[PDB]
Amino acid sequence: TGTESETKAFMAVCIETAKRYNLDDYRTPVFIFERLCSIIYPEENEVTEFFVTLEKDPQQEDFLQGRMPGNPYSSNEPGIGPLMRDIKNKICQDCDLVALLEDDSGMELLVNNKIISLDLPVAEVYKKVWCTTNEGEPMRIVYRMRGLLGDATEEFIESLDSTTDEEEDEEEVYKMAGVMAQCGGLECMLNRLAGIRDFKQGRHLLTVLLKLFSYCVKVKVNRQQLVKLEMNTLNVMLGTLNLALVAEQESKDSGGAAVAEQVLSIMEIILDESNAENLLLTGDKDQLVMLLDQINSLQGLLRIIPYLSFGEVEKMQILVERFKPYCNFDKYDEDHSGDDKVFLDCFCKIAAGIKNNSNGHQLKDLILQKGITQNALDYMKKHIPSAKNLDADIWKKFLSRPALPFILRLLRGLAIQHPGTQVLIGTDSIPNLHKLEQVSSDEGIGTLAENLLEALREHPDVNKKI
């Protein structure tokens, strides 16, 4: 408990003593890194059970009906939290204030002779109002009905002073999170992740590690370092994500989904920082295989897919030959299931998420050579109504087909930063797409047509055509 320089020295020595411990012991690093995370952002005591005392107004005791014997009220009890509107409702129900329950502004809660808006959370109000002068004391609230005693003279706090969410030095309450990056502590926890081979005995260590990583990825110097290839973070946490996914598949409700979405966040932030300023950074397409089967088991992993698609054609061909047959839009309109529509949306999102790179361009060209874009063009040419008036029942029936919005989505995804797809779509489907643009539907078919037109507008010839 002191200055910043001594804090930095203490964390340097903390990483130093973390080093000497091996990669197999799974207990002491838990404590070291949870201490790191706790002193990273000073934890605020969010008590799961804090007593709330709801007392009548001494000047309005006679007017209020019914006494409440439940004081003090526990937070875990129903009617207390997470919003003080629930507290007001509980007060009305206990005091049989049926009329006042419906009226939100007819009754007010006073804390330290201050008015608090009903929308503010109970925990935040207790921490920022009651704890400022009466820390360690029961949460006292005086309920009084508005109007009899004249205009309120107490201060009204509509909103509380939240933490500084701007970029002040935003890793400033996370200044600690740059310290071990400066001293080279990042590789220590990276090897700690590299040393994880079990999920049953490594849930707590992984949890503290991901929490500290989420705290640290909001640091300029941390993400700048993570851009570098020397510490090869991508492979390590891709392996950890794969382990989490297989553990989740083995046993449901083991916490795998939460850790998976946190890893997804670390992907999106790391790749965004890297692109702000790689072929072997993510590896070949070998891991793309079981990533695809996990997909078969949402935008984050589909956006990661192109980065992991820097490999051999015999593995993108698996994706292509799995995603081709179920695009039978004739059969889809005739008969399709929920799995088919999930699979179609996955295909559309994959097409949307293809990055503009050499291997991405190769994948797009290979997909186009399969004629699935040609299949979509044939489906529009065959099934679009020829009626000039767009309000005809034929047009509405055509819009009612579930395949059309997905086809528009996949065409837009294949038509971004791809001249060949743009030329192919704009060769003959321009009048049909323009007609579909003018029509508004409950499924957003017109909006999707407009987006597809904008995507095709990248090519100057197609833009001139439109």
> Following DSSP, what letter does each residue of 132-185 receive, concatenated?
HHSTTS-EEEEEEESSTT-S--SEEESS------S-SSSTTTTTHHHHHHHHT-
DSSP letter string over 60-94? GTTTS-S--TTPSBPSSSTTS-SBHHHHHHHHHHH
Q: What strands lie across the sheet with 107-110, from one edge to the other?
A: 52-56, 139-145, 107-110, 114-116, 155-157
Calculate the CA dihedral of residues 83, 84, 86, 89 and round it to 10 degrees: -160
Asked how this structure was determined, the answer is cryo-EM
Contacts of residue 34, defined as CB under 8 A and 6 or more positions apart, other chains included, come to 208
Q: Are 104 and 85 in contact (CB under 8 A)?
A: yes
The residue numbers preceding gaps of C to N over 2.5 A in the chain are 277, 297
Counting Cα atoms < 13 Å in the Cβ hemisphere of 356 gives: 6
SS3 370: coil
Q: Rounded distance, CA 2 to CA 186, Å? A: 24
For 225, other C-beta atoms within 10 Å of its C-beta total 19
Of how many residues is the chain composed?
A: 466
Nominal resolution (angstroms) = 3.1
Q: Which residues on adjacent β-strands are paired with residue 156?
A: 115
Helix (H) or strand (E) holding 125: helix 122-125
438/451 Cα distance (integer angstroms): 12
Strand, helix or coil for residue 289: helix
